[PDB]
Amino acid sequence: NSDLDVNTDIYSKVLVTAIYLALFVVGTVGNGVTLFTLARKSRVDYYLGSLALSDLLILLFALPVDVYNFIWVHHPWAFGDAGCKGYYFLREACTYATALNVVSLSVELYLAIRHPLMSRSRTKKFISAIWLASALLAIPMLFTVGLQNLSGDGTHPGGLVCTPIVDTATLKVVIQLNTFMSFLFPMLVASILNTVIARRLTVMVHPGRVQALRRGVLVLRAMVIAFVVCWLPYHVRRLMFVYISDEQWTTALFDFYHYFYMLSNALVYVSAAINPILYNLVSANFRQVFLSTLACL
Amino acid sequence: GRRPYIL
């Protein structure tokens, strides 16, 4: 089954791998210590913790499977049907949860800057609601991807790959679903909200709350722009994967699709690693307790 | 000629 092979150079594999491992350690340590101190510590801490969990899931259970079975060995898939579906399901649920957390944070900040409720119980209930909804919107992937023997006769175990098992139309529908619901719409809402939040901050600012508020505004805007920039090439690739006709696909577009895969996923991990570092760059006491928690290791 | 199988 030499038709399933790709020609991505070794140096690119090693480079992208090294990047993935760097983002792995930075992201896991960052979000791990983040969850640690946040748990040891306030309304936004639940959203931040939710984000940290969302990132940790990808960094721990999606990153190794990716770096192994997607850039190093393209075939055969060695995680089974359950691993195949559970992987993409996890990814989708994660991106949905992240997006919804961002938008929710935008709303919370706007309300905390326009009028300066949501008790601890109610807030946690709402976070649970976000997670559940995220899991619900990730369901189609369980019915979209799967295992297929793409070898010449469909009998060779080396041709057992993890590929979408549904037709082009349905694939279009689910990919569009993900792109609209987890990217365009929510980040649009969050961008508008951030836009209003900025000027509201400028008009409010004309004692110690306004500085933390400014901090929150900058952090939030940073998270939004990071989300857009990082998740942009990701959604373009998935649309590129399906919308291009089978006759239009050439070897150049193939190899380029794989390099683009490397790039896009690299940025995807860059986001998950960029979440906690932004919390440190504000020079808040969070960085102090970050070094404090990082020291005892 | 050939189409990707990785999503």
Side-chain angles (χ1 to χ4, degrees):
Chain A
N1 48 21
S2 59
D3 188 33
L4 270 55
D5 306 345
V6 313
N7 202 334
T8 58
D9 60 275
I10 304 95
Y11 291 152
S12 63
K13 297 182 183 300
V14 180
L15 176 65
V16 170
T17 303
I19 298 178
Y20 284 6
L21 298 184
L23 296 169
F24 172 80
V25 288
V26 169
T28 48
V29 168
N31 297 275
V33 173
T34 300
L35 275 182
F36 209 85
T37 178
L38 283 183
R40 290 302 177 91
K41 287 302 174 58
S42 298
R43 182 184 302 174
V44 295
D45 293 342
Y46 290 149
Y47 302 99
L48 267 58
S50 181
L51 286 171
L53 179 67
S54 179
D55 300 333
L56 277 180
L57 292 181
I58 301 182
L59 292 159
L60 289 179
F61 303 93
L63 189 147
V65 188
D66 196 324
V67 68
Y68 169 75
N69 217 330
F70 283 145
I71 66 173
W72 276 109
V73 45
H74 306 256
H75 64 284
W77 177 262
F79 299 97
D81 197 28
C84 178
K85 301 183 174 187
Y87 174 78
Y88 290 91
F89 180 85
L90 174 67
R91 296 188 61 89
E92 290 275 319
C94 281
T95 185
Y96 275 105
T98 304
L100 295 183
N101 280 322
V102 169
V103 180
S104 184
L105 272 175
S106 298
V107 179
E108 293 288 337
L109 180 59
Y110 175 80
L111 265 62
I113 209 171
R114 168 63 178 175
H115 305 266
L117 288 315
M118 281 290 184
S119 59
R120 303 173 59 90
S121 57
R122 288 184 288 180
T123 293
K124 289 193 253 64
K125 295 176 196 303
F126 181 69
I127 297 297
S128 300
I130 294 184
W131 278 108
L132 178 58
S134 311
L136 290 171
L137 298 177
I139 295 184
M141 291 305 171
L142 300 176
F143 296 78
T144 301
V145 300
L147 291 183
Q148 276 192 348
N149 199 320
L150 294 189
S151 59
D153 297 26
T155 60
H156 198 285
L160 179 63
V161 300
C162 179
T163 180
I165 57 184
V166 84
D167 62 331
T168 306
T170 310
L171 188 57
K172 284 180 181 178
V173 178
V174 295
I175 292 178
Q176 286 166 193
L177 167 71
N178 183 29
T179 305
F180 282 118
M181 298 298 103
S182 65
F183 187 69
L184 289 179
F185 176 79
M187 290 305 107
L188 192 49
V189 174
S191 58
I192 305 309
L193 264 54
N194 279 261
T195 299
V196 186
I197 283 177
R199 61 180 182 91
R200 195 66 63 186
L201 177 62
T202 63
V203 72
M204 176 190 172
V205 76
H206 287 270
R209 182 181 178 179
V210 291
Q211 298 183 359
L213 256 53
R214 178 200 304 262
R215 188 180 303 164
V217 172
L218 270 66
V219 163
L220 185 66
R221 283 187 288 174
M223 289 190 298
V224 174
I225 61 101
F227 195 98
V228 175
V229 169
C230 296
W231 292 94
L232 180 58
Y234 173 78
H235 288 119
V236 172
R237 172 182 57 81
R238 304 167 72 255
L239 288 168
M240 174 186 182
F241 171 81
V242 55
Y243 269 92
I244 301 183
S245 181
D246 302 346
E247 59 173 355
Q248 288 186 285
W249 274 103
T250 62
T251 56
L253 284 175
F254 192 83
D255 302 24
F256 168 76
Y257 172 81
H258 293 59
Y259 292 116
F260 188 31
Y261 185 89
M262 297 182 180
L263 173 67
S264 54
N265 290 26
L267 295 183
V268 168
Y269 296 145
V270 158
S271 176
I274 215 71
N275 271 343
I277 186 186
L278 295 177
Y279 306 153
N280 291 325
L281 290 180
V282 297
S283 181
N285 302 274
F286 174 84
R287 185 176 62 181
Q288 189 69 64
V289 302
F290 184 85
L291 269 62
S292 301
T293 309
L294 186 59
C296 53
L297 189 271
Chain B
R2 55 185 303 176
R3 183 182 184 89
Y5 50 85
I6 301 180
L7 182 57

